[PDB]
Amino acid sequence: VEWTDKERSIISDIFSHMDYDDIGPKALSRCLVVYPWTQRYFIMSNANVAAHGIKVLHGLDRGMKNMDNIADAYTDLSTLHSEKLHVDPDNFKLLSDCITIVLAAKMGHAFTAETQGAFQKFLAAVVSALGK
Amino acid sequence: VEWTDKERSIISDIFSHMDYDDIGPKALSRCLVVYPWTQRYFIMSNANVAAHGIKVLHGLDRGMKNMDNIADAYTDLSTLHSEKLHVDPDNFKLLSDCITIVLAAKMGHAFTAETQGAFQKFLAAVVSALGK
Amino acid sequence: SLSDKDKAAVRALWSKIGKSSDAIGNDALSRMIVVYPQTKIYFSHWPDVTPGSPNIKAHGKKVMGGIALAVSKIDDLKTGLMELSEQHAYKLRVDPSNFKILNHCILVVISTMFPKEFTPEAHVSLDKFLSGVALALAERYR
Amino acid sequence: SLSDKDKAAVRALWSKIGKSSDAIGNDALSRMIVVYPQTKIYFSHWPDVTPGSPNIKAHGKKVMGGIALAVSKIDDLKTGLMELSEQHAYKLRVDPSNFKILNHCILVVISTMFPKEFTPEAHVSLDKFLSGVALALAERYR
Ligand code: HEM
Ligand code: HEM
Ligand code: HEM
Ligand code: HEM
């Protein structure tokens, strides 16, 4: 989509100061607790949940590296979660919100509205690519 | 997006047997009654509502004629409703459902599931272009 | 929440269309399956999940039976549909986002069969009613 | 619907964060305005609709005042927020789809300020609570 140099910098900055082993597990754990119906696909101490939590951020990393091709970068995963895993699409938005809330807790006041905006646009783009 | 020859034929068939002066007014009227908060932008007998109802179908007509460029065909309207009219985007989906329900009542049993599918995909594409 | 005007409208409409409930259920499930393919996974254990199949016709009766139950328990949907909520949340594990989908297909079907009776006034009340049904079914999810 | 466990969680959390309600309101409105630009139109009559502006700081107090009211009327949000629903539906004519937006910004703000207290358990209860608040505010729309 249309990215600004500022958005590219913010997203790049967020990812370079994000500890995937910390954020991934926390975001997925929170999602399974806040929206319990997503527990079916698999809470805080479960290594399997932690593992997939890390994989999610690593999956985002891929889109952060090639922000211009976000749509085509997720074809393999869109099909996996859809055809094989049968994850209802609405759940991508639920996880996205949890990732945002977890990142907000880590960044504190550094997670400005502008930072939130760029990040939400980034996740919206990834979510669409996943439901594609 | 990806249209099949069958989808093109169905959508073409629907539009060629659709009376805009009948469907337009009925769909908009229903929307203002079912989701009253959309009344603010402007019920059955109001000529102004009828007029815009007709315009909506004529706007769909444009996308039906060039189904491959649905996204770029609505730039002028996306901006009008957004920047000038300030129509909340969620309302495009509400109208779309009303158009579907009104068409279903007119077509009766001819409005098969397959017909509904093609039509909903068509409207989903237009709605996205409008919120673009 | 449903007003007395809403409850009267739903009872009056149900009084008129209830006779064709088997047909409405079959048609509504058929459409959901065809138009919204992700829902298919929930009925994968059936051999025939194609429109008008014997499994779908049968289930359409059970679904409309739940709607008739909701109409009779209209004054308190939360208590009335508690068992169905528990069933969908725990036993079936149906993602709650799907309730709004079926509701839409039900409205389409009713519209195709009773165009004269499914007026916009019957529509707002039925739509509020179905939202309450969906909300009641979501009760036991968290 | 909120359980007793949910009500206790919301009261306990509110007990802890309530002191910073002015700051939470200002921050939550600021974010909504910046992240979701379509909401700006509702506050167009204010001269300064930029983050931390005097108008937004002021309103943030009023919004959090509504949340505090909701917490105190937690046992019946429909009756408790009836006047606010009527106000948003009729006087303000705020599109009901926006309630879910502000709720999300409130959660973000609380998370940035009270990371230690905003646990996932406090989150599910607060999320259910805010959905009930949004549902209550939507009461008078139709
Ligand atoms: C929104 C971002 C998402 C991304 C980027 C993502 C990414 C991934 C990746 C990288 C894998 C590993 C696939 C492989 O083995 O090659 C995976 C697997 C899987 N995902 Fe996700 N996922 C997402 C959302 C979801 C959601 C919402 C659920 C539902 C709670 C979910 C459930 C699963 C499950 C159960 C597996 C298979 C078992 C496993 O290997 O962990 N994912 N996902
Ligand atoms: C989903 C399809 C939509 C299409 C294709 C559509 C199309 C149009 C068109 C062709 C016009 C005339 C613009 C001109 O004068 O050049 C218009 C105007 C307008 N639209 Fe829509 N519209 C849509 C949705 C909406 C929605 C959801 C609302 C809100 C209820 C709305 C409210 C208005 C208003 C108030 C005007 C300006 C006054 C008028 O000329 O009627 N429209 N629309
Ligand atoms: C909004 C209206 C809904 C109502 C009133 C409803 C009602 C029912 C009822 C009465 C049963 C039969 C239970 C029994 O025989 O003990 C049932 C079963 C079931 N429902 Fe629903 N349901 C609703 C929505 C959904 C949705 C949207 C889905 C999934 C996309 C769903 C999936 C199922 C499944 C998979 C079963 C079991 C099917 C079988 O194995 O025969 N239901 N439902
Ligand atoms: C979900 C929480 C919400 C609560 C608790 C809430 C609460 C309030 C309260 C207490 C007032 C002050 C009324 C008075 O002073 O008499 C108010 C005013 C108002 N609200 Fe909300 N509101 C909510 C959501 C929203 C949303 C999402 C919007 C719009 C995007 C909105 C737009 C307004 C506007 C435009 C005013 C009047 C502003 C002014 O002229 O000063 N409210 N709200």
Side-chain angles (χ1 to χ4, degrees):
Chain A
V1 299
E2 227 60 56
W3 295 106
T4 60
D5 279 2
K6 199 173 195 178
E7 290 169 344
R8 292 176 183 273
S9 185
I10 291 181
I11 291 162
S12 175
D13 192 17
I14 287 167
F15 274 89
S16 68
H17 293 253
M18 194 190 283
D19 180 15
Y20 299 6
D21 305 306
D22 178 48
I23 307 305
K26 287 184 179 170
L28 196 61
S29 296
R30 185 168 295 254
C31 186
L32 303 198
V33 172
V34 181
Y35 307 108
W37 51 97
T38 54
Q39 288 183 16
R40 78 200 191 95
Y41 303 103
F42 302 87
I43 293 175
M44 242 74 83
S45 50
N46 188 293
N48 300 296
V49 166
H52 177 268
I54 289 170
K55 296 190 185 173
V56 170
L57 259 72
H58 273 130
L60 289 183
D61 174 272
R62 166 199 311 205
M64 178 272 303
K65 284 169 182 173
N66 200 337
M67 279 167 72
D68 297 291
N69 279 101
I70 288 182
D72 300 299
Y74 295 99
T75 295
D76 78 288
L77 286 182
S78 178
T79 299
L80 182 71
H81 289 87
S82 181
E83 186 44 47
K84 178 204 159 199
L85 276 4
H86 294 299
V87 170
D88 189 278
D90 186 53
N91 303 324
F92 288 132
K93 208 291 184 294
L94 305 187
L95 181 51
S96 285
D97 288 348
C98 293
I99 294 180
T100 295
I101 286 151
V102 165
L103 193 63
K106 183 186 190 165
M107 290 185 71
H109 294 306
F111 190 71
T112 54
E114 180 166 36
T115 300
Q116 174 183 351
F119 199 52
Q120 274 178 204
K121 177 179 179 172
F122 175 68
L123 294 181
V126 174
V127 170
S128 298
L130 281 178
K132 173 195 58 196
Chain B
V1 299
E2 227 60 56
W3 295 106
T4 60
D5 279 2
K6 199 173 195 178
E7 290 169 344
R8 292 176 183 273
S9 185
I10 291 181
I11 291 162
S12 175
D13 192 17
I14 287 167
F15 274 89
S16 68
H17 293 253
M18 194 190 283
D19 180 15
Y20 299 6
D21 305 306
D22 178 48
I23 307 305
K26 287 184 179 170
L28 196 61
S29 296
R30 185 168 295 254
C31 186
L32 303 198
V33 172
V34 181
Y35 307 108
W37 51 97
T38 54
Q39 288 183 16
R40 78 200 191 95
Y41 303 103
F42 302 87
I43 293 175
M44 242 74 83
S45 50
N46 188 293
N48 300 296
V49 166
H52 177 268
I54 289 170
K55 296 190 185 173
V56 170
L57 259 72
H58 273 130
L60 289 183
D61 174 272
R62 166 199 311 205
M64 178 272 303
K65 284 169 182 173
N66 200 337
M67 279 167 72
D68 297 291
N69 279 101
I70 288 182
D72 300 299
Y74 295 99
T75 295
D76 78 288
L77 286 182
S78 178
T79 299
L80 182 71
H81 289 87
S82 181
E83 186 44 47
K84 178 204 159 199
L85 276 4
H86 294 299
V87 170
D88 189 278
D90 186 53
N91 303 324
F92 288 132
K93 208 291 184 294
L94 305 187
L95 181 51
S96 285
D97 288 348
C98 293
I99 294 180
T100 295
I101 286 151
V102 165
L103 193 63
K106 183 186 190 165
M107 290 185 71
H109 294 306
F111 190 71
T112 54
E114 180 166 36
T115 300
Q116 174 183 351
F119 199 52
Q120 274 178 204
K121 177 179 179 172
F122 175 68
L123 294 181
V126 174
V127 170
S128 298
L130 281 178
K132 173 195 58 196
Chain C
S1 69
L2 305 174
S3 67
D4 293 304
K5 167 178 157 283
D6 286 322
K7 296 179 185 173
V10 179
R11 289 174 190 130
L13 179 66
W14 189 244
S15 180
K16 298 165 184 166
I17 78 175
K19 50 170 169 276
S20 309
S21 86
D22 305 325
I24 297 173
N26 173 52
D27 203 355
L29 284 185
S30 293
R31 291 173 187 277
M32 178 179 80
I33 244 56
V34 174
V35 184
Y36 306 92
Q38 84 251 41
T39 65
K40 273 181 177 174
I41 194 63
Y42 295 103
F43 314 98
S44 61
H45 55 292
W46 290 344
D48 204 4
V49 188
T50 61
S53 95
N55 300 100
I56 287 189
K57 264 185 174 56
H59 195 66
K61 289 182 64 181
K62 293 203 292 174
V63 179
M64 292 320 285
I67 300 292
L69 173 61
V71 177
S72 77
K73 303 298 180 179
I74 208 160
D75 301 282
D76 186 11
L77 298 165
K78 169 179 159 64
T79 298
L81 309 181
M82 187 75 69
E83 288 181 13
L84 279 187
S85 180
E86 194 110 73
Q87 193 167 353
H88 288 76
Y90 305 140
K91 198 219 201 81
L92 305 170
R93 297 226 98 277
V94 168
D95 193 283
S97 57
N98 296 111
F99 295 132
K100 44 178 153 280
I101 292 180
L102 178 51
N103 285 166
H104 174 67
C105 295
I106 287 174
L107 293 178
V108 166
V109 174
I110 287 166
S111 193
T112 66
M113 299 178 177
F114 301 95
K116 218 291 174 290
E117 303 95 323
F118 192 58
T119 61
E121 297 66 50
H123 188 172
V124 60
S125 288
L126 189 58
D127 188 42
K128 283 180 74 176
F129 169 73
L130 294 177
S131 290
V133 172
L135 227 70
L137 286 163
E139 190 59 43
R140 302 290 293 109
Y141 283 74
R142 66 175 183 164
Chain D
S1 69
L2 305 174
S3 67
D4 293 304
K5 167 178 157 283
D6 286 322
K7 296 179 185 173
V10 179
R11 289 174 190 130
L13 179 66
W14 189 244
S15 180
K16 298 165 184 166
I17 78 175
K19 50 170 169 276
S20 309
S21 86
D22 305 325
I24 297 173
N26 173 52
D27 203 355
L29 284 185
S30 293
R31 291 173 187 277
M32 178 179 80
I33 244 56
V34 174
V35 184
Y36 306 92
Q38 84 251 41
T39 65
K40 273 181 177 174
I41 194 63
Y42 295 103
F43 314 98
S44 61
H45 55 292
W46 290 344
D48 204 4
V49 188
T50 61
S53 95
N55 300 100
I56 287 189
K57 264 185 174 56
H59 195 66
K61 289 182 64 181
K62 293 203 292 174
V63 179
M64 292 320 285
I67 300 292
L69 173 61
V71 177
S72 77
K73 303 298 180 179
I74 208 160
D75 301 282
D76 186 11
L77 298 165
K78 169 179 159 64
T79 298
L81 309 181
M82 187 75 69
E83 288 181 13
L84 279 187
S85 180
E86 194 110 73
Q87 193 167 353
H88 288 76
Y90 305 140
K91 198 219 201 81
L92 305 170
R93 297 226 98 277
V94 168
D95 193 283
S97 57
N98 296 111
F99 295 132
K100 44 178 153 280
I101 292 180
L102 178 51
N103 285 166
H104 174 67
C105 295
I106 287 174
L107 293 178
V108 166
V109 174
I110 287 166
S111 193
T112 66
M113 299 178 177
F114 301 95
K116 218 291 174 290
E117 303 95 323
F118 192 58
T119 61
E121 297 66 50
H123 188 172
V124 60
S125 288
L126 189 58
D127 188 42
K128 283 180 74 176
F129 169 73
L130 294 177
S131 290
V133 172
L135 227 70
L137 286 163
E139 190 59 43
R140 302 290 293 109
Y141 283 74
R142 66 175 183 164

